[PDB]
């Protein structure tokens, strides 16, 4: 299962990033409607999850409490908005490397709240993976790093909530995805309506209807990814999903750099060898 999930998430999110860059950097005026883009993505993902439930998991009955889904959705939205605000306040690469350090906060929050215990081998493997990924990514005053720290904390809280949900309610992947996406859609729609970006985005889309096409395609990609991601969240737990995401980002960066043939600095060599060492140790004892 793990290789299949890795391959699917990697390719789907690579195409997702390509489409997101194409839409954002089109310069048709400038696209300053990120919030409505996330809202559309959430709506499409919710519709896809409903279709999957109706076609595959009709027999199952959801047992999770609604407030748990609401809490998970608000935590995820808070993480997203904090990361975007930090990116606005801080240079792009630093935000990327900060978001790459998800497993550490996820594990720490899990241990502190759910009282989970992990073997020190897992601790060392996760620390080594995170350090290697950070080192491989370019490595060179506050009030901008605090936002990244808050985003990491909110991501850890989301992981804790998902772990508790799956442990004590056996939540299905499709149900979890659908409910989280519905709550996120509600909150984002309320925020968009209040801020008024809905009308500006609608006028922008009417001026350039072609965007719609890409948007739809873009949204579809996200759906697929979320599915796999949520599967990885349920079958293996949030920590494994975080590690998978970080490793996927590292592999994408490594593939792009080697394709561009950018001189690989020795520090990047140490980073990649460390990432491989940690991944192998985790797999041998995973």
């Amino acid at each position: 299962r793990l290789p299949l999930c890795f391959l699917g998430v990697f390719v789907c999110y690579f195409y997702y990033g390509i489409l997101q860059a194409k839409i954002t950097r089109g310069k048709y005026e400038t696209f300053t409607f990120a919030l409505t883009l996330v809202f559309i993505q959430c709506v499409i993902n919710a519709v896809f999850a409903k279709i999957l439930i109706q076609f595959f998991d009709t027999a199952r009955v959801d047992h999770t409490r609604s407030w748990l889904y609401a809490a998970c959705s608000i935590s995820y939205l808070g993480a997203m908005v904090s990361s975007n605000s930090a990116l606005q306040f801080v240079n792009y690469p630093t935000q990327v490397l900060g978001k790459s350090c998800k497993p550490i906060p996820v594990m720490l929050l899990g241990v502190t709240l759910l009282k989970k215990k992990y073997p020190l081998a897992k601790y060392l493997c996760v620390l080594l993976i995170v350090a290697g990924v950070a080192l491989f990514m370019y490595k060179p005053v506050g009030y901008g790093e605090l936002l990244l720290l808050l985003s990491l904390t909110l991501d850890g809280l989301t992981g804790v909530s998902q772990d508790h949900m799956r442990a004590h309610y056996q939540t299905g992947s499709n149900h979890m995805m659908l409910n989280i996406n519905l709550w996120s859609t509600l909150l984002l729609g309320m925020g968009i309506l209040f801020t008024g970006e809905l009308w500006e985005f609608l006028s922008f889309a009417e001026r350039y209807p072609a965007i719609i096409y890409n948007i739809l395609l873009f949204g579809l990609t996200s759906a697929l990814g979320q599915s796999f991601i949520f599967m990885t969240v349920v079958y293996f737990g949030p920590l494994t999903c975080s590690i998978i995401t970080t490793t996927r980002k590292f592999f994408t960066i490594l593939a792009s750099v080697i394709l561009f043939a950018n001189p690989i600095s020795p520090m990047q060599w140490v980073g990649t060898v460390l990432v491989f060492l940690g991944l192998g140790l985790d797999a041998k004892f995973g």
Partner: single-chain antibody, 235 residues
Framework: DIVMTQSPASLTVSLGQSVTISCRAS??????????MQWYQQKPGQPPKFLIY???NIESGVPARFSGSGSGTDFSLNIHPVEEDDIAMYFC?????????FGSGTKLEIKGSSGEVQLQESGPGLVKPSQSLSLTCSVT?????????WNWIRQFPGNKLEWMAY???????DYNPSLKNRISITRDTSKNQFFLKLNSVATEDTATYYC?????????????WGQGTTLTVSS
């Protein structure tokens, strides 16, 4: 469906001894590292009492004497300082799959021998075979539109429990797939009742029917039970 087997049919123990009751499932009952097991205690002529959920968590208010252990397809319930109070039948239930099942039951015996929810069940005491039947469970002290599953269960002669069906406060209902074609569960919030209807009851349906309230946490737990109503089908 999963079949639960309890190795000791009946155990003879002395006061103060430690007793271990074993239960085994035909299939793994672990869902993401948590064992979906429950243990109930039923005294003679009384509804089963909920004791343990998750195979390791003692229900609040239960004495610390009881404890649960095991994993995979083997579980055990331990009572080290057994007293006269804990003399009853013990049932192990699995909530891993929709047709929740109870073990054959283990009997324990001694040598030398407005502030809560109230449920009341009503129904005919004697019914001829092939006649549609309808039992009504009325709830007082609580509203069936709040967050609680309301289940209909039955116990045959020999103390072999069998969960018939349930309805959630949202109206979502689940049935035992074996009986999904024969029974139907409905509710009436105006009177705060819920009804179970059986079509063409046969002589095999003689049993004591309980209506219980259950909350889902690490599996379905029937914390509160009705007093049970007998039903005898005879020619």
């Amino acid at each position: 469906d999963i079949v639960m087997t309890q190795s000791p049919a009946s155990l003879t123990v002395s006061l103060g001894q430690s007793v271990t009751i074993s239960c085994r499932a035909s299939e793994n009952v672990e869902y993401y590292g948590t064992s979906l097991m429950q243990w109930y205690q039923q005294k003679p002529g009384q509804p089963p009492k909920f004791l343990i959920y998750g195979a390791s968590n003692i229900e609040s208010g239960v004495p610390a004497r009881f404890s649960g252990s095991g994993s995979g397809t083997d579980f055990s319930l331990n009572i080290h300082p057994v007293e006269e109070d804990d003399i009853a039948m013990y049932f192990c239930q699995q909530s891993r799959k929709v047709p929740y099942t109870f073990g054959s039951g283990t009997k324990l015996e001694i040598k030398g021998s407005s502030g809560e929810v109230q449920l009341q069940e009503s129904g005919p005491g004697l019914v001829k075979p092939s006649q549609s039947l309808s039992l009504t469970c009325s709830v007082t002290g609580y509203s069936i539109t709040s967050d609680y599953y309301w289940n209909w269960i039955r116990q045959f002669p020999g103390n072999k429990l069998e969960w018939m069906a349930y309805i959630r406060y949202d109206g979502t209902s689940d049935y035992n797939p074996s009986l999904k074609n024969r029974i139907s569960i409905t509710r009436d919030t105006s009177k705060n009742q819920f009804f179970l209807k059986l079509n063409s009851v046969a002589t095999e349906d003689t049993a004591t029917y309980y209506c219980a309230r259950a909350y889902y946490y690490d599996g379905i737990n029937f914390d509160y039970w009705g007093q049970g109503t007998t039903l005898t089908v005879s020619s």
